[PDB]
Amino acid sequence: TLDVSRQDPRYNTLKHGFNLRWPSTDAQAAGRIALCEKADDVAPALQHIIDTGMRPTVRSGGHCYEDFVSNNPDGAIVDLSLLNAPEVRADGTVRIPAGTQNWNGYLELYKRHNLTLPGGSCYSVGAGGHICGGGYGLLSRLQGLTVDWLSAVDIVTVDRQGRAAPRTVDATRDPELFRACRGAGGGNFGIITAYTFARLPEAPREVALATVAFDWAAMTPERFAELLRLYGEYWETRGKDPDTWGMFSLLKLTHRSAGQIVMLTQFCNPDGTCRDLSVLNDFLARFRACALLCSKPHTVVRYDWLTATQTVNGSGPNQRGKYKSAYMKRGFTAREAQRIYTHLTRTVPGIDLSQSLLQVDSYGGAVNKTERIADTAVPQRASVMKLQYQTYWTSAADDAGHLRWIGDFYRDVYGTPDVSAPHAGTPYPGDRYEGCYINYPDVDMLAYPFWPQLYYGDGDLYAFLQRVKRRYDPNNIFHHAMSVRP
Ligand SMILES: *Cc1cc2c(nc3c(=O)[nH]c(=O)nc-3n2C[C@H](O)[C@H](O)[C@H](O)COP(=O)(O)OP(=O)(O)OC[C@H]2O[C@@H](n3cnc4c(N)ncnc43)[C@H](O)[C@@H]2O)c(*)c1C
């Protein structure tokens, strides 16, 4: 372990992660970062921190949207980012240590055994937060969530007597903690050192990437509603069919100041080839090219899968971000389409909303296996679209404008009629929505006493997680603004 305290030249860099908002103040910053050099460092590093009464937060790839890692006033960040070399065995079993970044992981899994894991696209996201939060990406309609493949988890927990020790959890060993590690989100129960997979799916051989853009200059409320109708009605119907599960679409409903709305679709057949583009052609044909809604000319480019996966792996700039999430079981209502149009066309004097957007992901397919409700901590297994509201900016001086823009936008979309008065402002689970995604955490939801039901559903999961919390972190060593409460 390397100790990076405030005397160390690395401190100013290592006190933060990807989102430059955190820590908000120097007072809130960690006093030190414990950079673990091997898995065997983790329990002793943790033991040293808690033995002094200091609080640990936990970092792997640093991508947390919220202050969960970096807001730890004069505490210790236990950093597992150097624990990054996957083990891909000749028998196809895989171990992904927590610091493995998504793209490095895809390269290793692909080259060593023609395997992949259906997680996120961003190159720099770490396994540690990503997988236990229920990570998904462009292959998840085909192959399900990252957590749907997990066979075992190596985790350091702290017992009632305050002793940190490694354990391995799986279907028969601490099975309730295993289930919690399959989606509940990080920084809750202990420090995951590695994820084990008895089997992974084969990497696809070939994909097509289709880009369809729409000029904002021509985008009326009616054309915008037609775009949302065509897209959402597809995922609610045809997109449930298995022959479509290799198709994954990102509709970037940009703020008007971005100039264009962009839809990026990846496609393979279920067998991982592009032997038949019919499903993609049929999907794209719903979006008529100009040369009433009409698009810029469609671009469809074929790649081998690894090459496409590299070309889409960007993380965007290192800057300030605010994010929100919603799971949709249905197409857009006319009221949703109108409220979204309102906020995407709203001018806010003194701030640049050109990087801001509502992203609407195709969802469901192989995710939507109800047997995973009982053995994972991802209860949202009936959604057809997954939404990520995003605003990005450079300067702390502009925080208030950006937070207000995205806060008002979200509250309005999920307001009265489509949502009950008691839950208004949230995509509360029911006939229309399935709530929120813990890997896109939103501390604005702490304003609502029912925030745990947004993330963990209206059923018994949160109480289950509270029981795991009492059993495996009885001292509440591991916490943050949205951690499972004892
Ligand atoms: C920055 C970023 C995030 C993205 C991106 N694209 C995603 C995508 O395509 N699919 C997704 O499903 N999610 C995407 N996300 C969001 C990420 O999934 C989340 O931001 C992950 O939680 C990030 O994980 P990581 O990079 O490890 O982030 P940290 O900030 O280190 O920790 C997050 C969270 O988890 C806890 N924690 C970290 N490490 C551990 C370990 N080893 N054990 C337990 N708990 C751990 C932290 O306490 C914190 O709560 C694309 C981009 C650009």
Residue numbers in the entry: 2 to 292, 314 to 508
Which lines from the publication concern this structure?
In this study, we report the biochemical and structural characterization of a recently discovered carbohydrate oxidase from the bacterium Ralstonia solanacearum, which is a member of the vanillyl alcohol oxidase flavoprotein family. Due to its exceptionally high activity toward N-acetyl-d-galactosamine and N-acetyl-d-glucosamine, the enzyme was named N-acetyl-glucosamine oxidase (NagOx). The structure can be divided into two major domains: a substrate binding domain (S-domain) formed by the C-terminal part of the protein sequence and a flavin binding domain (F-domain) at the N-terminus. Steady state kinetic analyses revealed that non-acetylated hexoses were also accepted as substrates albeit with lower efficiency.
NagOx formed large rhomboid-shaped yellow crystals with 19% PEG3350 and 0.19 M sodium nitrate that diffracted to 1.5 Å resolution. Even though, according to size exclusion chromatograpy experiments, the enzyme showed a monomeric conformation in solution, two NagOx molecules were present in the asymmetric unit. Inspection of the structure revealed that the isoalloxazine moiety of the FAD cofactor is bicovalently bound at the interface between the F-domain and the S-domain. The FAD cofactor is bicovalently bound via 8α-N1-histidyl and 6-S-cysteinyl linkages with residues His64 and Cys123, respectively. The isoalloxazine ring is exposed to the solvent area at the bottom part of an open active site, while the ribityl and ADP moieties of the FAD are embedded deeply in the F-domain. Other amino acids that form the active site adjacent to the redox-active isoalloxazine moiety are a string of tyrosines (Tyr66, Tyr137, Tyr345, Tyr414, Tyr459, and Tyr462) with several neighboring polar residues (Ser122, Gln381, Asp383, Gln410, and Gln412). A short stretch of residues (292–313) is not visible in the electron density, which suggests that they form a flexible loop with a disulfide bridge at its base between Cys291 and Cys316. In the active site of NagOx, a molecule of ethylene glycol and glycerol are bound, providing a hint about how NagOx may interact with its carbohydrate substrate. The ethylene glycol C1 atom is 3.0 Å above the N5 atom of the flavin. The O1 atom interacts with Tyr462 OH (3.1 Å) and Gln410 NE2 (3.2 Å).
